[PDB]
Amino acid sequence: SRSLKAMGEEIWKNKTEKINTELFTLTYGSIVAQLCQDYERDFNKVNDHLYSMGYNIGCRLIEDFLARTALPRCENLVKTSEVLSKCAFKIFLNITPNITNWSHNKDTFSLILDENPLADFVELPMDAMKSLWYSNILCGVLKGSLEMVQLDCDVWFVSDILRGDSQTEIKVKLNRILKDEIPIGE
């Protein structure tokens, strides 16, 4: 019907309610703050628990995304990349991550977050300078949502601007495209 970029811009313009980014930052920061507080700053497992958060929320969010866009099922990483680059992030967080690091045989790629609205202003302590990610909810959402389009994916963080690296990257390697089910009867 239309290009993915045009679809994303059109739906974001006049087909969605809106809320201030700063409030979203405060909410997510308070969540991470409480997680940090009551785990005794054991930052190895807060990552996993935020991953569980992301899986849970994105596994519902995929229904809203598909109900809005009504796209067909994705089949290969080439078109999936186009989708979650140029519509899916635009509808929700109003950003357009770039695609780079195309691995061999088009197996994996990486999302470069030019702007992360989850960390608009953040300064981690020295304890978390090389232990915490603070954005595990994003890749958790990605894994949870892509699980529901019938494709299993391994997604994790490579770098983050908060930790001091040059850019924030999320490798979204695919493991196997699981097939549909069938109801036999014996």
């Binding site: 809106k18 980014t21 409030l23 979203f24 969540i31 997680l35 009551d38 996993d48 569980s52 929700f92």
Partner: protein, 207 residues
């Protein structure tokens, strides 16, 4: 100024009671992330667990969630004061101005609708009355299970209690002379009937 889709924000805000139980169960389904197996338990199961867990577990989880809401209010209030700049003073001219500021600004910028009329004893406690309470407009169990429905929602009502408690903090009064309690005693008096049947009331007292 930049914005985010309201749906994802609402879903994140709702997914705190599942946090509030998952975290506590971790202190006191399985899948491999990349090399190590992490355990995840579904969000809808944890709310049912909170309904039927314990009297002392529930109090701990509610206190934790109130602390979360307190952080929301504490961080949010300074930003609203810098942005909108109300005609308040620090400690106390009158509580009516403070509550008017909360109603006119905080609930605008958190939820999509101004909070409705509020009672006033002029001496002690104030009642903040909201009809249909946006973040639970699509919560239900069954056609017949109505008491179970209401008793299953109550932990979700700690987010605004914490928000109000935080907003009162950093504005004079600390969290020792302020007590706030949410309840479902409100009625749908004459408004059009929405999905959820019962309103929300915040009995908030200061001294």
């Amino acid at each position: 100024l930049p914005k985010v889709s309201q749906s994802v924000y609402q879903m994140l805000l709702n997914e705190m009671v599942p946090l509030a139980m998952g975290i506590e169960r971790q202190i006191s389904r399985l899948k491999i992330e990349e090399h190590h197996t992490v355990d995840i338990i579904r969000s809808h199961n944890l709310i049912h667990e909170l309904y039927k867990a314990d009297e002392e577990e529930k109090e701990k989880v509610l206190a934790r969630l109130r602390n979360i809401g307190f952080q929301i209010g504490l961080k949010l209030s300074e930003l609203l004061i810098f942005s909108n700049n109300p005609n308040l003073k620090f400690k106390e001219m009158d509580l009516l101005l403070i509550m008017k500021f909360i109603c006119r600004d905080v609930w605008k910028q958190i939820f999509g609708k101004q909070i409705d009329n509020l009672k006033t004893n002029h001496r002690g406690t104030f009642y903040l009355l909201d009809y249909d309470y946006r973040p639970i407009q699509s919560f239900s169990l069954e056609e017949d299970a109505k008491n179970e429905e209401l008793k299953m929602i109550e932990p979700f009502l700690e987010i605004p209690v914490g928000i109000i408690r935080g907003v009162l903090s950093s504005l004079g009064y600390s969290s020792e002379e302020v007590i706030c309690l949410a309840s479902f005693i409100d009625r749908p008096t004459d408004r059009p009937k929405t999905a959820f049947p019962k309103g929300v009331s915040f009995h908030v007292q200061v001294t």
